[PDB]
Design a protein around this ligand. Sequence first.
Ligand code: OGA
Ligand code: MG
Ligand code: NI
Ligand code: ZN
Length: 331
Amino acid sequence: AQNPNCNIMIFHPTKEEFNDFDKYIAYMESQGAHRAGLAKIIPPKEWKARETYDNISEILIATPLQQVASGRAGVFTQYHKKKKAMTVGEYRHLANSKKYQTPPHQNFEDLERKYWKNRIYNSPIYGADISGSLFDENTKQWNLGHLGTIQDLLEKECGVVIEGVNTPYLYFGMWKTTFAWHTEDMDLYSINYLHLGEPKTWYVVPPEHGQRLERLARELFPGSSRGCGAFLRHKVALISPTVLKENGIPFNRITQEAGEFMVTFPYGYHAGFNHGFNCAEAINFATPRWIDYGKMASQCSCGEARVTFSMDAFVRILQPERYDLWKRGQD
Ligand SMILES: O=C(O)CNC(=O)C(=O)O
Ligand SMILES: [Mg+2]
Ligand code: NI
Ligand SMILES: [Zn+2]
């Protein structure tokens, strides 16, 4: 069995190997990459996502989200308070202000320490989930707006034709902006490209041990667990590495830098934080190996998770027994 310890693997494809996206995902899996839940892909030196970023300040963040925490430093939830719209230029200036800027620090490890110690005492503002793309249309390799769609994958594998679309999203981060512990909708893959700026630290639980994290989360967030049998779908709970280690939960950590891709694999729980002002682009995708995870994915039916239009067909086809209850939580 490849990668039996479930370590995060880092890949350096050549320009030739960067042509065929599906083939390279399958290659990484042949080497056991999926067992970690997360992989890093460093593009060949000849590749570029676009020529410059010199012209991005006019993008609009319609609904910036202030991430307010409750709990203790290592075990907390965050809620998103909506803020007034601002441009990326306005947001970048805000990020770089004395109130929000990255503190002085020695290295990534020191910054990680400061994050876990101090995150709860601040409310950073995140520009998340903005539909759009920063890949140049002339970028032919690993262009996250030109991937094969999840609907087409389900149609190719299963023969059924469904509605829905699959587009990328932009994330504008600042110091301490936080992504809570989650798997993707329908336990899909994700791919994330860090276009510019400061790093993003990731934590991940191997898919084979995801239920260990779920059981700890039920213990640590007992009211939330009573409210909903899949409350991690709410994407609000944080648990630190120190707490994970204390409870014996297997996990790994890695820091993504600008110019790098990360792939999350089906049912790979992940969480993390941004080091400073940055911009990432991400999208969900499927492969044939996903289909069995899609069929088994948990679902939130309490009303909180509310998701895209395109998840309807996934539930309806893959999980017909669950469909009626889940759709009630959508409506
Ligand atoms: O970058 C972020 O804030 C969150 N991204 C992801 O969870 C992802 O790409 O799957
Ligand atoms: Mg612009
Ligand atoms: Ni994710
Ligand atoms: Zn729920």
